[PDB]
Design a protein around this ligand. Structure first.
Ligand code: FES
Length: 106
């Protein structure tokens, strides 16, 4: 399924992500350098921060308590649509999802 990672300067990078793969994993294994994913996807670091386009924030599972706590420590601006993309699992239902990546993770 399609996922578009828009870098902070506007570059739209599209990837085909298989079902069950997190957006963080697909990102770090396909050159999306603006996403670090340091902890490996256990909602333990804040380095996979992205802004989910509002047309999809409702189709994606709500952030659990751990993510909510971790998001408080994001280094870039924290927005209402901020999410740790390691917590977003790709599914056909999300095909076309767009996420904007901040200018910093650390
Ligand atoms: S990869 Fe660490 S919180 Fe997402």
């Amino acid at each position: 399924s399609k996922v578009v990672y828009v870098s902070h300067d506007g570059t739209r990078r599209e990837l085909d992500v298989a079902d069950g793969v997190s957006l963080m994993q697909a990102a770090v294994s396909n050159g999306i350098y603006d996403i670090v994913g340091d902890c490996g996807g256990s909602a333990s670091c804040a380095t996979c921060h992205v802004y989910v386009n509002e047309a999809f924030t409702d189709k994606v599972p709500a952030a659990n308590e751990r993510e909510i706590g971790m998001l408080e420590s994001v280094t870039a601006e924290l927005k209402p649509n901020s999410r740790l993309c390691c917590q977003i699992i790709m599914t056909p239902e999300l095909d076309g999802i767009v996420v904007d990546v901040p200018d910093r993770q650390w």
